[PDB]
Amino acid sequence: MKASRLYTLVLVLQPQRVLLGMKKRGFGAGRWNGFGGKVQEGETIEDGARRELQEESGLTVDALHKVGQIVFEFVGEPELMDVHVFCTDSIQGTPVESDEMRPCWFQLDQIPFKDMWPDDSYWFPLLLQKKKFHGYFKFQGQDTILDYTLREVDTV
Numbered sequence: 001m002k003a004s005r006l007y008t009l010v011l012v013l014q015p016q017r018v019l020l021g022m023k024k025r026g027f028g029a030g031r032w033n034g035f036g037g038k039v040q041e042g043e044t045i046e047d048g049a050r051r052e053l054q055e056e057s058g059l060t061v062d063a064l065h066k067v068g069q070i071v072f073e074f075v076g077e078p079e080l081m082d083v084h085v086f087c088t089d090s091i092q093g094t095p096v097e098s099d100e101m102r103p104c105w106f107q108l109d110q111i112p113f114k115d116m117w118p119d120d121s122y123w124f125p126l127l128l129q130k131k132k133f134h135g136y137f138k139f140q141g142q143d144t145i146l147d148y149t150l151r152e153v154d155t156v
């Protein structure tokens with residue numbers, strides 16, 4: 001048995017495009033991703049997701065919808081990363097580059113999988129189909145998946 005730390009991940013998914021950010025430093029640097037980070041004490045997971053979206057992309061949204069949960073394990077790290085994944089289609093300002101992230105829109109036939117975390121190839125298609133999911137991925141380093149599980153669920 002392992003302990004887990006809470007993280008959020010937010011995808012702004014519109015009918016023809018999705019907003020990603022190029023991570024400029026830190027964990028996952030060099031990969032396009034949604035926006036997110038560690039949940040803080042006292043806030044709900046959804047509110048931590050809203051906060052991270054604002055801090056990293058400049059976008060302020062009233063509500064997010066939970067679409068999945070993914071647990072990450074790394075060889076040599078005792079602590080699991082419990083990532084709660086949220087979407088919205090509804091925004092009302094422009095993204096702005098932060099120290100963490102350079103936002104960029106991608107058309108939905110140009111999802112930059114080769115420059116995303118390798119596990120995203122498995123679960124992101126479910127997100128695009130508006131399905132809900134639970135996943136688990138064990139990584140050796142940044143690139144290599146040793147074990148994983150992915151399941152569609154009716155309730156996250």
Ligand SMILES: Nc1nc2c([nH]c(=O)n2[C@H]2C[C@H](O)[C@@H](COP(=O)(O)OP(=O)(O)OP(=O)(O)O)O2)c(=O)[nH]1
Nearest residue numbers: 007008009026027035036037038081083117119120
């Ligand atoms: N798409 C995708 N996202 C992931 C994976 N693993 C993983 O931690 N994430 C997300 C969850 C968080 O949004 C982010 C990791 O949190 P972070 O290190 O950016 O947290 P933070 O903003 O609190 O960090 P910092 O500013 O203190 O350095 O990456 C993955 O394999 N695929």
Ligand code: NA
Nearest residue numbers: 036037052056
């Ligand atoms: Na952050």
Ligand code: NA
Nearest residue numbers: 035036037100
């Ligand atoms: Na972050």
